[PDB]
Amino acid sequence: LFALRYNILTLMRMLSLKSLKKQMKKVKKMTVKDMVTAFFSSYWSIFM
Amino acid sequence: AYQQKLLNYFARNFYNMRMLALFVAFAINFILLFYKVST
């Protein structure tokens, strides 16, 4: 349980940082290619 | 909406990709049968 809690907190610190604004600046300007890349990257991060 | 479309596609094709992985593994291991060690 400690390993689960710690690792999941490390994963969700991604969202917790709130620094997603600089990514979102280009989220206004993504293409379908880029959004597919982000979709894959989310699952890659989960697997990591 | 596009995220949901991707989700639906992968959920639909989960089993087919599982079969394809086994087929590709058999192909790779068949290729590895012609494998020669060198000095």
> Do A8 and A39 contact (CB within 8 A), yes or no?
no
Q: Contacts of residue A34 in chain B, CB cutoff 8 Å?
A: none
- CA closest to A39 among chain B residues: B3
Tell me, rounded to whole angstroms, the distance of Cα A4 from its chain centroid: 18
Q: Which residues of A touch B (CB under 8 A)?
A: 32, 35-36, 39
* Cβ-Cβ contacts under 8 Å for B6 (sequence gap 6 or more): A36, A39
Angle formed at CA B20 by CA B19 and CA B23, multiple of 5 degrees: 90
Start-to-end C-alpha separation, chain A: 18
- Can you give the resolution of this entry in Å? 3.1
Q: How far is CA A34 from CA A21, A45, B1, in A?
A: 16, 16, 15
What is the phi/psi pair of residue B15, to 5°? -70, -40
Mutual angle of helices B2-12 and A32-47, in 10-degree steps: 60
CB B2 within 8 A of CB A35: yes
As a whole number of angstroms, the distance between CA A16 and CA B16 comes to: 37
Structure obtained using: cryo-EM
